[model samples]
Target: VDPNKIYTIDEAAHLVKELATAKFDETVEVHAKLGIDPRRSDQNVRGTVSLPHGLGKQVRVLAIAKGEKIKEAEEAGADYVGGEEIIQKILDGWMDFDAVVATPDVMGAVGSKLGRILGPRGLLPNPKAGTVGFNIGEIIREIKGRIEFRNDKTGAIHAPVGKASFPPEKLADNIRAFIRALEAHKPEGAKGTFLRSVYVTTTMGPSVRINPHS
Candidate 1:
C-alpha cells in the first residue's frame, strides 16, 4: 500500500493473490498509468496482447460466418456459430458470448447491425484485433488467448492479467506480457512519461504498485 515504493512483479503477484478475499475465483488485473493525451489520435494507446497465462475463465466465442466458415468456427471450439441468424439473436438482445469473430464478408452486417451495441462494451470485432478474417477457426483460437488494452480518459491501461487461482509465477508472467505489449506498442506521438507507473490488484483487493520493468 506504500505510494512511493514499488513492489517487484513476483512480490506484487503474491500480494495480489494473498489479498484476494472473494468467495469465488477472482481476476487479477494490471493498471498502468500512462502519460498520453486521449484527445489526440496519435497519442491514443490501443492494441491486443496474448497473455502468457490466460484469465482462467472459459471464453465463450460467437462466430459470425457462413457455410464452411461456420463449420470451421465450431471445429475450433467456438461456443456459438451461425450467419444472419446469430446476428438477429444479438439484435434481439442475446449477448451471451465474451468475444465475437466474423468472416470478412460479414463485417458489413456486423458493423451496421451491432457496432453501436458492441463498441461500448469492447465486444465489437475488428480486423486490427484479428477478430475479423476468413480463417474463422484460427481467429477463434487467437481471440480466446488475446485481450485488448486501451488507455482511458485519464491515460491508464487496465486489463486482467490472470485469475487469483493462478500461481504467483504465472501471474507475474502475464503481467510481464502486458508490460511488453505496452512497450512495443507505444504510440509514436506519446510524450513525457509513457509508462508513469504500474499497479496490480485482484478483483476485490487493493492496489499494489508494481515494478513491471524489474
Candidate 2:
C-alpha cells in the first residue's frame, strides 16, 4: 500500500487514457483485489450475477457433466462438453474453453483432469464463481460474456473488453463488476496474500488500482 499512490475508480479509469495516449506494444489489466476473504462458515462462497451489459468480448464456456442438463448447457451456450472429452482435448493440446462450468457430480473428475490447465487461468469452476453447481443451464447463462482473468508466468493477467474510448461511467461499472467477480473465488486453500494486487490499464497504458471500500 503506497499512500501517495492511492487511487479512486475514476482516477484509474482516467489513467488508462493517460498511459496509452502515446504508447506502443503495451497491454493493460483493469482490475483490483482486496485482502479480504468473503468465505465464511455459514455463508456459501459461490454465486452468479448476469451483467445486463456484456463485457463486450467473446467468452468461451465449457460445461462438463452428464444427464439431461447437458442439453440445458448447450441451450444456455457452452462451447466445450464432457469431462473425458475435455481431458482428451487438453491432452492433445486442443483447448477452446474460456471459462468452465461443471455440475457438482463431475467437478472432481473435471478438476482432476484439467485443474492444472484451467486453475492457473482462473477458469476452473470453483465454488465462488457459481460455475460449480447442479443447475448447469442457469449458471452458464449467468456468465454470458464474462472472461477469466488470471496472471500468466510473469504473474500478470490482462484483458480488454472495450477501450478507454468508452464512457467513464461505463468503464467504472465494468471495472466494479470485474473486481467483485474475481474476488468471489479466493481459493480456500490459498496461502499468502490471496489477492496480491489488481490494476486497470488500457492497451498501451499504466497500471491503476481500484478501491475495495469505495
Candidate 3:
C-alpha cells in the first residue's frame, strides 16, 4: 500500500490476487477517484462495460413486464418475470434478485411501488444505464453480458473488476476493458485530470495504488 509507488495495471492485477486472504473467493474491485463533482449533471459519470472473461459470478435478474415480453425475458434467461404481481411482491419485501429490468410502460408502476427501494440500490432501470427499453430480449441479454458503474458522491467509482479466483491475465484484461469504457464517458464540462488516481483491492484486503495515467 505504498502511496509513493504507483503500480502498473498488470502489476496491480497480480498483486491484488496475492494480497487476498479471504477464505471465500474474493471479489477484486477497482476504485477510481475522479476529478469532477458528482453533483454536477455534466460530470455525473455512468457507463457499462463487458469484461472480456465475464464476471465470475451468476447474476440473478428480475424482469418486470407482461404477456409476451415477460416470456421474452424468461426465455432470455431472466430469473424472475412477472407484471403487477411482481411489483406487489417487491412492495412486500420480496426483492430477491441481483438486478432488475423493466419496460417503459411499467416504469410508472415500478416507481410508485419500488422506486424508493430500488433507486438507492442503483438497481432502478433507467434509459441512460441501458436498463430501460422496448426490446425486452435484447435488453436482458445486454444486461447479462455487461456490468454498470457510476460515480459516487465522493467523485469515485468503485466496481468489481473480477473474482480473485480469476487468472491474473484475465483480471488484467477485465481491468483494462473497464478503464477504457470508463474513460470514454468523460463528463462534458469536467476539468483537471478526469481520473485522479486508481486503486485495486480485494473485498477485504489492502489496497494497491495504480498509476491512473498509465
Candidate 4:
C-alpha cells in the first residue's frame, strides 16, 4: 500500500494490521474530522455506541451502587460491585477496571469524592452518557462493549475500533459501527458537510486516509 494512498475502510482495516510494529497487539483507532463548531454547545458531539464486534478485548467494568442494585450489577457480569468500599478503593488509587457504572442515588457519594479523580480520565459515570441510571443490568451490558465518542477540542473524533490482531472483516465491522455512531448522533445544529474526512491507524503506525463515502 502506498503511504499517500486513500483506502476504503476494508482496505485500511487490513492495512492497519500490517502496519502494527509493536510486539504486543496494538489497538486500531479511527479518526474523523467533522464539520461542526466545537465551541458551540449545541454542535458538540458526544454519544455512546455498542460496537457489534467490540474492541477485540474484554471491558472490565466497575459498578458503584447499593442494596438491590449490587445484585443486578453482579448478575450482569460486573467485575467489581459495591458502594463506599469501592469508592474508597478508587480513592486509594486502585483503578483495576476499565469503565464505571453507578446508580443515580449514589452520585452524591460518587460525585463528591471521585469527581477530581475520575473526571480527567473520562471514567465518571455521568447520566448524559447513560452510565448513571437505575437500569444497571442493561447499562452493564452496554458498558461491556460501548464505545464512547466525543469531539476533541479540535473538532475531530478519535476512538478505538479494535486490536490490530483482529481479522479484517471484524475490524471493518467495528469501523462501520463507529461511523454509524457518529452519523447517528449528528448534531442538529451542524451545518455544511458533517463528516469531512476519516483515517484509520494503529499505535506507532502511519495514518491511512479512508474513503468516508465508501
Candidate 5:
C-alpha cells in the first residue's frame, strides 16, 4: 500500500470534484470491495440508503398499487402511478421510470411480469429495500435521490454518493451515510474485514483510494 495515497472522506470528495472535467455534472461514485463471498446467499448484502442531499438528479418514480393506494401514490409525488394498467403497460414494454414502488398485494401479482424487466435493472420493489409497503406516501417522500447498494457477482458494490458539482461537505455526508448503511447491512455470516477497500471517483476522473476508517 502507498503510505501517502489514502485520503479522508472529505479530501476524497474534494479531489473527486476537482478531477472531474466533464462537460456536464458528473456523478461521484464509491466502489467498495467486501470480504464476503458473493456466491453464498446468506452473505449477500442488499439494501437502500437515503442520501442527505440527494444525488443531484431527479429520480423518476413509479408506483404500483390498487384502489385508494393508487390515488395515494399519485398524490405522493410519484411520476407514474397505476396497478394492473401499469403492469400491462410494462408488459407491453413501457419502462419510463427510474424507480418503482409497490404495495405488497400488487407486488405478488406483478412480480413475475416485472422480474424479467425491472429485476435486472434494480427497479423491482422489495420489502428489504423499503420499496414495498402500504405507506406509499412516506416511501415516495424519501424515494427521490434514494439509492440501493448490492454486491456484484464479484463481491464488490458500486454506487453513486452524489455529484461532483455538489458542495464537498454534502458529498462527504452522502458518502458517510452510505458507509454507515453498508456497515449496518453486513451479513452475519460474513467473516473478517467486511470492508476490504474503498475507492472514490467522479464520472470521468481517475479513482482515488480512501481510508475506510476516515
Candidate 6:
C-alpha cells in the first residue's frame, strides 16, 4: 500500500462535501496546477477558489469589475469587489480577500498594478478556473457558496473536496465528484501524462489511501 496514497481524489472531494454535512475542526486546501508551462506565453491558465464548505470554512469571493458588472457581482453576493479602490487598498497592503476574480478587460490592469501583490499569494485569477471569463454570472455561481480547489505546480491538483466527518461511503462519493471534474478539465496543452501523482489528507493529520477509481 502506498502510504502517500492514503487520500484519493475521490476521498478528498467527498470529504469536502461531507464537511458541508458535518462541522469540521480544521481546514484543508486542495491545490493543483496543470503540467503546461504558464511562462511559455502560449496558453496560461491560473486561478483558485475557497469554498463555502471549505472542506470546512467559508471562502470569500472577490471580483474586480466596473459599474454594472460590479453591481452584478454585489448582487451575486461576492465577498469583496476589486477595482481602482481595491487596487489602492492592495497598494496600501491591506489584503483581506481570500481569492481574486477579474474580468478579461481588468486582467491587464491587475497585471500591471496589483500583480506584484496578489501574484505571490496565488490569488490572481487566470483562465483555467473559469475566473477570467465573460460569463461573470456563471463564474460567480461556481465560486460563490461552493467548494474551491486547484491543481498545483506539480502538474496535479489536490483538495479537501470532502469532509472527514462523512461516512466512509459518503466520503467516497464526494471524492469521485472531484475526480471526475479534475479529469474533465485536463488541459489540451498538457505534455506528459496529465496526472502523475495524487493523494489526500485531513486537517492537522496524516495522509490516507483512496482508490482513484473508487
Best by TM-score: 1
lDDT of 4 at 82: 91
Global lDDT of each model?
A: 0.84, 0.62, 0.82, 0.87, 0.85, 0.59
Expressed as tens digits, the lDDT of each residue in 179-199 for candidate 6 is 566666666776765544445
| Candidate 2 lDDT, 1-214, residue by residue in tens | 3434857877766666666665343333464443443343422233333443454235677788877878878777677667545667775776665677888887777788778888887778887767788888877766765554544433344444446566666666667666666566555554556446766776555566656434
TM-scores, all models, native as reference: 0.76, 0.48, 0.70, 0.73, 0.73, 0.52
TM-score, prediction 3: 0.70
Off by over 4 Å in 1: 56-59, 65-77, 82-84, 103-129, 132-135
Question: Per-residue lDDT for 45 in model 5?
Answer: 90
Sort every candidate by lDDT, greatest first: 4, 5, 1, 3, 2, 6
Question: Highest lDDT among the candidates is held by which one?
Answer: 4
Estimate the Cα RMSD of every predicted model relative to the unseen true structure: 3.6, 8.1, 4.2, 3.9, 4.2, 7.0
**Per-residue lDDT of model 4, residues 34-95, tens digit only:** 99989988889998778877552458899998899999999988988898677878888998
Evaluate residue 25 in candidate 5 and report its C-alpha lDDT on the 0 to 100 scale.
Answer: 89
Q: What is the lDDT of candidate 4?
A: 0.87
What lDDT score is found at residue 70 in candidate 2? 83
* lDDT tens per residue, model 5, 1-214: 2435989998898888888999988888888999999898899999888878755245789988988998998898788888866787887878878888999988777788778788888789988888899999888878876887889989999788888888899888988888888999999989899989998888788888898778
Worst 10 residues of 6 by lDDT: 48-57
Better of 2 and 6 by lDDT: 2
